[PDB]
Design a protein around this ligand. Structure first.
Ligand SMILES: Nc1ncnc2c1ncn2[C@@H]1O[C@H](COP(=O)(O)OP(=O)(O)O)[C@@H](O)[C@H]1O
Ligand SMILES: Nc1ncnc2c1ncn2[C@@H]1O[C@H](COP(=O)(O)O)[C@@H](O)[C@H]1O
Ligand SMILES: Nc1ncnc2c1ncn2[C@@H]1O[C@H](COP(=O)(O)O)[C@@H](O)[C@H]1O
Ligand SMILES: Nc1ncnc2c1ncn2[C@@H]1O[C@H](COP(=O)(O)O)[C@@H](O)[C@H]1O
Lengths: 227, 225
């Protein structure tokens, strides 16, 4: 759903596509305007985080669906933060869908398609060459990011249920937030109705995807989207 | 603005009054219903915090403006948490009123009327007989309390600008949140207009106090007082 176009040693173009994929590509569709929506939401979120002192890969915009981002040496991780029980957490804790967690939960996943992104702990992370000190910094940033996004969205009647982040190292060795932040990579629920406003609408045919993504955008910006 | 009526060794009654005082009692007024509103908001906040595992002195209600609280050995502190630049923080940081802080700020003040509650640090605290370990627990609780109150109020279009907390020790030596939590001890701004919905309305004659306090109550409860 993204194309990464290299510019040079320190920069690249992240291009968002209208393609939607789920269940290892066994389920596919195209949603006109999805890419535009995901790119724009990523811009909103990254700038918001930058305002709070979070270091992100975001440099600028190069078109409706194209972002310019700094090239990073990526950690082979998906860093998942969870505020409300949903998806795979139901397989892990004896709690129902929708349960509000007393504190946010951080899960680490080894980014590996062949092993289907298995969950790992700090010991596994060391074997994969990630020091405990780096892990602690990563989780700390992820939790800060969580609070900013959660609070921002909560004021707009949107529950940040959970989300995945990715991180990399820049030239100076600092840990930098990367990839995307969109309804493709977050679970967003309406505060009142608890309906999904994210990729789960596609994954489980719970409704109209472009409709859901437009809803997020309009609530955040105060404006209907024009792709 | 409160009367503390002792019951026995472990309990007391905190009575909220309609009296309002500012600038060392050089400015005084009475606001019909203020005490009731402060007592009720204190109940709402303490119960909210108790729900999240915060230990508080709140036991129960003994009338519209009377709370039953557990008696504590008080720390001689005001513990102030700040999310948004206002009041005395403007004298300390080169930042305008309304500036949103990247992270919450915790300030300690020594509770002493004659010295007009001066700001202190961890070294001064130790002299006043408060260990660094206690201080760290205090600030940790204060930051937890901040996050719950801020998030709760934000969903209701209210900015938690800053607020004062007080703490004491119970019989078992645990650190327990005490005093009150009300528009007398917090700065609350309307999210859209940024107008004060707290004691600043009285302090600086920015409007109608009872109006501002009723507004807070109605937004929280969904009911007119
Ligand atoms: N649970 C408690 N146990 C003992 N003292 C308390 C408790 N809660 C509050 N206090 C103290 O009771 C007093 C009530 O506040 P207030 O009437 O405004 O007094 P003051 O104006 O001197 O701060 C304060 O001195 C406060 O520190
Ligand atoms: N490979 C991935 N791509 C995009 N988002 C993901 C990925 N893995 C997990 N997430 C997000 O992380 C959260 C938790 O997913 P799950 O573990 O399936 O419950 C959800 O918001 C997902 O959208
Ligand atoms: N700043 C970055 N530098 C280098 N690689 C990145 C950066 N941000 C994201 N990526 C990777 O680019 C790929 C694009 O995601 P996908 O659309 O799943 O192919 C993923 O492998 C990401 O880990
Ligand atoms: N002695 C006090 N009595 C009541 N509230 C206070 C006191 N000191 C500080 N506060 C509260 O803590 C915050 C910071 O106050 P200041 O340092 O006066 O700007 C404000 O919300 C005040 O209402």
């Amino acid at each position: 759903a993204k194309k990464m176009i290299p510019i040079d040693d320190d920069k690249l173009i992240m291009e968002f596509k209208d393609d939607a994929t789920a269940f290892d590509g066994t389920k596919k569709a195209r949603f006109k305007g999805k890419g535009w929506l995901n790119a724009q939401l990523s811009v909103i979120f990254f700038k918001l985080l930058e305002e709070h002192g979070i270091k992100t890969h975001f440099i600028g915009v190069a078109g409706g669906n194209r972002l310019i981002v700094e090239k990073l040496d990526m950690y082979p991780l998906e860093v998942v933060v969870r505020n409300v029980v949903a998806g795979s957490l139901k397989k892990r804790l004896p709690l129902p869908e929708g349960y509000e967690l007393p504190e946010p939960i951080v899960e680490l996943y080894y980014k590996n398609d062949e092993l289907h992104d298995p969950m790992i702990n700090y010991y596994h992370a060391k074997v994969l060459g990630i020091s405990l000190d780096e892990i602690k910094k990563i989780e700390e940033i992820a939790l800060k990011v969580n609070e900013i996004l959660k609070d921002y969205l909560a004021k707009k009647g949107i529950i940040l249920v959970d989300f995945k982040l990715e991180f990399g190292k820049d030239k100076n060795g600092d840990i930098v937030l990367a990839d995307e932040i969109s309804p493709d990579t977050c679970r967003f629920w309406d505060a009142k109705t608890k309906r999904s406003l994210d990729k789960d609408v596609f994954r489980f045919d719970k409704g109209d995807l472009i409709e859901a993504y437009k809803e997020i955008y309009e609530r955040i910006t105060g404006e209907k989207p024009e792709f």
